[PDB]
Amino acid sequence: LDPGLQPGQFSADEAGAQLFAQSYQSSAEQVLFQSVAASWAHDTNITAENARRQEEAALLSQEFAEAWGQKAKELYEPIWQQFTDPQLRRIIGAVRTLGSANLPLAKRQQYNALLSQMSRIYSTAKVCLTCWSLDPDLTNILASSRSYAMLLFAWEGWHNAAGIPLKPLYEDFTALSNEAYKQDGFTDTGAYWRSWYNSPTFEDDLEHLYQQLEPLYLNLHAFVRRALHRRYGDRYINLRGPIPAHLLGDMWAQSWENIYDMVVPFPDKPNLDVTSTMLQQGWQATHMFRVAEEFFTSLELSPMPPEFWEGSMLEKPADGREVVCHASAWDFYNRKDFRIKQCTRVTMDQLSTVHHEMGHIQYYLQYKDLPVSLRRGANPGFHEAIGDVLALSVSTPEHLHKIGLLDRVTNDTESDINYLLKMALEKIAFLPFGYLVDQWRWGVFSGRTPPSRYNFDWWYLRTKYQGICPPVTRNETHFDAGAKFHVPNVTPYIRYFVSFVLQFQFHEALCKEAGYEGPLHQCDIYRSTKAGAKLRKVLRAGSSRPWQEVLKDMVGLDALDAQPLLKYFQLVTQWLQEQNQQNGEVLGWPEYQWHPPLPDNYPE
Ligand SMILES: *[C@@H]1O[C@H](CO[C@@H]2O[C@@H](C)[C@@H](O)[C@@H](O)[C@@H]2O)[C@@H](O[C@@H]2O[C@H](CO)[C@@H](O[C@@H]3O[C@H](CO)[C@@H](O)[C@H](O)[C@@H]3O)[C@H](O)[C@H]2NC(C)=O)[C@H](O)[C@H]1NC(C)=O
Ligand SMILES: O=C(O)[C@@H]1C[C@@H](C2CCCCC2)CN1C(=O)CP(=O)(O)CCCCc1ccccc1
Ligand SMILES: *[C@@H]1O[C@H](CO)[C@@H](O[C@@H]2O[C@H](CO)[C@@H](O)[C@H](O)[C@H]2NC(C)=O)[C@H](O)[C@H]1NC(C)=O
Ligand SMILES: *[C@@H]1O[C@H](CO[C@@H]2O[C@@H](C)[C@@H](O)[C@@H](O)[C@@H]2O)[C@@H](O)[C@H](O)[C@H]1NC(C)=O
Ligand SMILES: [Ca+2]
Ligand SMILES: [Cl-]
Ligand code: NA
Ligand SMILES: [Zn+2]
């Protein structure tokens, strides 16, 4: 570790810890910048040389974390929990968490190499017949093909190409990750991840939220399954079984918005899928980011700095570079450089993703003056919710009209049902998936799910919560969890379930603050500087304060709450229940063992 980056001696008291934290911040920014920059260079240009550079930067970060973490314990272990400065307690708490820096050198290198190789495999995997990438090629097939056999080829091809080679690496990663965090005092890595929510009843709290939400998902599921049965027929759709996992418009069946045309009940109302209008009008990726930015500035939040426009990767490169296309938002920890890396496609759902990413950036801009250790969301679910809250306002027909994407605005109950159904395909359908991904990983980290049951337990959970089934037989040579970005890229997922609940609590509070009085689903907080001020107070707080207190200041409650989401969707919840009763549906999938047959001439 460079001499200028090493911790000196400080007095073993709170005054000394303040100075220690200031000195840490100065050097941490340098070490994080080099690590984030090396990761950027690789993720926008996947090469062996750039991977090498990123692994060397990660090794330096581990040296830094070990030196400062050990110094924090040497000086403050018996006293930091009693410091009067609550933010300093949180800073010291973070610095003394070494994570992978607990590993000896050789295992650090193995750990860093595994992360690099799992990332490369996921983002360079192809499906060949001439080869298709996940983004845009297979994504577009899953979204717009209605050939059962073509969807199956893409779904099976992708899961095989990404998942199979990842399994041996993921086993090794898990063991090293657990070894690292056991030395920070956690039973396993999942316990460390769950500890971020600082709730002794986290898992019970989540389960009670899901019990309130599940009836909405069950009714959406049955209605969509019936719509698919009318198109694909009784051979490929079992009205009492799980839905084949490749038929819902998305590789992971996690968002069902692409099958809106098959379920829309009132099709002579305005067409809420504005993708075709975006294309007709000549929208490009940069337009989508400028439109998102101007929503933020309408709230008197910050515009994107020049460094963002000059440095970001907002489209897939056409120069032959391999890149990580999965959308992400980057803080370089120098208070200057902030970037999005997204292979943006011109579609309505990508407009939502753009807003999601710019919500991340906006958080970074607002808390950039805090100490580096507090530059994060009040909890990770907060960070995932910011952009989604704005996207809820952007998606309303009145707002789409204002930005020229919808010529006619109607305000009637049929239009309400269309709108809420489309939003439910996006928000309700996701809930079981957002919940189940980390249940899978928590079991892997705890040892409940050994490598010999990776796929067995994945599909147990996929069927249990989502009510889907694989369209071809799978076995433990397959590693289908690994075919989802966040698993090989070691990004926790429960934050997205928390986000999908939280964003409706935020929306309700900001709509009230904006003076809006009508139905929650027609609120648009555009140009509400009062709502902007309330959101800004959250963003500027970072992790300086307990999330429960930040939430209470914002929405009036110190806990996650499903009631705002339930209230948003109430009209379509009742409508779907009525439709399913009238149609004689079975809610759920009691024929849980059912899988569809293979097409006759497959893959031929
Ligand atoms: C879409 O339309 C709904 C319903 O509009 C109502 O019913 C129609 C058939 C017409 O008769 C309308 O004239 C009538 O308002 C709108 O929802 C309604 O919004 C108004 C405010 O714009 C709400 O009134 C307020 O209520 C609060 C608390 O009660 C008072 O403090 C205010 O002073 C004000 O009176 C009204 O409650 C609300 N109704 C429902 C059922 O939500 C909706 O705003 C509209 N959408 C858009 C985008 O304009
Ligand atoms: O794709 C998913 O599964 C989820 C749900 C989706 C969301 C889009 C808007 C509407 C609701 C669904 C967004 N997302 C993401 O992973 C996008 P991120 O930036 O969090 C992914 C961040 C990955 C970790 C990272 C962070 C910084 C730099 C490099 C890597
Ligand atoms: C992608 O990364 C590679 C390195 O992995 C870059 O190639 C280097 O480019 C510099 C300047 O052009 C040369 O001096 C080096 O000799 C190159 N190294 C190798 C290994 O080829 C490449 O420029 C990057 N591409 C983009 C578009 O940024
Ligand atoms: C695992 O699965 C591989 C792929 O074939 C699958 O299983 C066979 C039995 C058929 O049902 C086919 O439709 C499926 O896609 C096999 O190549 C492999 O042998 C299977 N077994 C193991 C241990 O890997
Ligand atoms: Ca779409
Ligand atoms: Cl999380
Ligand atoms: Na989608
Ligand atoms: Zn995100």
Author numbering: 1 to 129, 135 to 609
Manuscript excerpt for this entry:
Human angiotensin I‐converting enzyme (ACE) has two isoforms, somatic ACE (sACE) and testis ACE (tACE). The functions of sACE are widespread, with its involvement in blood pressure regulation most extensively studied. sACE is composed of an N‐domain (nACE) and a C‐domain (cACE), both catalytically active but have significant structural differences, resulting in different substrate specificities. Even though ACE inhibitors are used clinically, they need much improvement because of serious side effects seen in patients (~ 25–30%) with long‐term treatment due to nonselective inhibition of nACE and cACE. Investigation into the distinguishing structural features of each domain is therefore of vital importance for the development of domain‐specific inhibitors with minimal side effects.
